[PDB]
Ligand binder design. Structure first.
Ligand SMILES: CN1C[C@H](Nc2nc3cc[nH]c3c(=O)n2C)C[C@H](c2ccc(OCc3ccccc3)cc2)C1
Ligand SMILES: CN1C[C@H](Nc2nc3cc[nH]c3c(=O)n2C)C[C@H](c2ccc(OCc3ccccc3)cc2)C1
Lengths: 215, 215
């Protein structure tokens, strides 16, 4: 019965992670010391309840930009064009001139986007190695390499109109570069017209795959 | 050790459910008896492998319409911005005049959409009570009630431009009916301009939340 743990305190507003892997607002209604660490009981605003580890709760405020760094464990807004969801990720880039003063987020499922400071929430008790709670092993391993090598970031230069092969579902596909935005490129898959924003250091882009397998 | 279980045959193309709850093409590489039933080993096209229950694999073909019914357990195409994913659900409506010859799908996460016959795949070994493998209990219970009562479906009649309260994250929001499509309405949330398709029998729509209470 930990009524408090640092600035965590029962009755506070909080975000908690659900089994959809999206994050939702609620109230912290209990803290319990249990075996090695602590667990946080959240009552979500839709009345659901969950007992969560400290890396599965986030503060209901936007961190000051000067408290974030490459590797920071965050919850960020994800937008499909009509709906908005909150999903966990890693800060891959902080605001700078070339990225038009945005944060690049690497989400736990492998997606990447640029967001603003007002679209982020800090996870309360992230693991010492921030990537170690990423479920997708290929994503986890990529983040570990990326944060460890930062700022050494191999990327490929692409231009609008350029024709390249892009990976999807374990095979290569004919694709076209539609647009470049900072460290991201918008790829059109020519066969079925899906579009995707992809990190320019991703080995899903054949030139990066190659530039990295160049022997 | 089996090479065949009915028309599940080692080497066949298949869809398998991953931990993202999306479904992905692969090959059936093994059939194993483990404990009381069978498991199906799938090698995904990206070379990952999973040992899956029969309700977590689907055939890689579109079922004949008129072999689908209300309650059928299916995998359906979902549009996520400019991306397309496969996700499990239940058939809520079969093609008719009112729905412009489409299938209404109630997805396992509570979303609903109309799809065509070429956007569906049949799950290989669904449970006889097909909803019983839905993880979200509120969703599971809704589907059980819906299928049991079908065709008797309380729904509210809405028209484009109508202003109503719609529930989201446990509170009620000023919203507007933008469009009616069969048993779905497209709701604009006026505060933040999110848009969402919602079933006209959902108690997230204030008028339905009251029609139900009135009964
Ligand atoms: C960050 N990811 C992004 C993902 N998109 C995406 N990922 C990748 C990866 C490589 N490429 C791409 C790509 O192109 N995209 C477009 C959608 C994903 C998501 C997950 C659950 C959910 O659940 C919604 C929900 C439903 C019911 C109740 C609560 C929540 C909604 C969205 C979040
Ligand atoms: C069917 N549901 C629909 C859901 N949308 C949605 N649901 C609800 C529920 C009430 N309302 C709404 C609403 O408005 N929406 C818009 C997105 C959800 C999804 C899940 C995972 C995923 O993962 C993508 C992925 C990423 C990396 C690797 C593999 C896969 C992509 C999409 C699927």
């Amino acid at each position: 019965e930990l009524s408090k743990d640092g600035d965590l305190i029962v009755s506070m507003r909080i975000l908690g992670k659900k089994r959809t892997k999206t994050w939702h607002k609620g109230t912290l209604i209990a803290i319990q010391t249990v075996g090695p660490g602590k667990k946080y009981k959240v009552k979500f605003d839709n009345k659901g309840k969950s007992l969560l580890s400290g890396n599965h709760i986030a503060y209901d405020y936007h961190p000051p930009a000067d408290k974030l760094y490459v590797g920071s464990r965050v919850v960020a807004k994800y937008k499909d064009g009509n709906q908005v969801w909150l999903y966990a990720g890693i800060v891959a880039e902080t605001p700078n001139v070339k990225n038009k003063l945005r944060f690049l987020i690497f989400f736990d499922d492998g997606y990447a986007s640029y967001v603003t400071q007002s679209e982020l929430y800090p996870i309360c008790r992230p693991l010492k190695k921030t990537w170690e709670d990423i479920e997708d092993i290929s994503c986890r391993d990529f983040i570990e390499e990326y944060v460890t090598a930062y700022p050494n970031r191999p990327m490929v230069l692409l231009k609008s109109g350029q024709l390249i092969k892009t990976e999807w579902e374990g095979t290569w596909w004919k694709s076209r570069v539609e647009e470049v935005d900072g460290s991201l490129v918008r790829i059109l898959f020519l066969d079925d017209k899906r579009c995707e924003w992809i990190y320019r250091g991703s080995t899903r882009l054949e030139p990066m795959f190659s530039m990295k397998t160049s022997s």
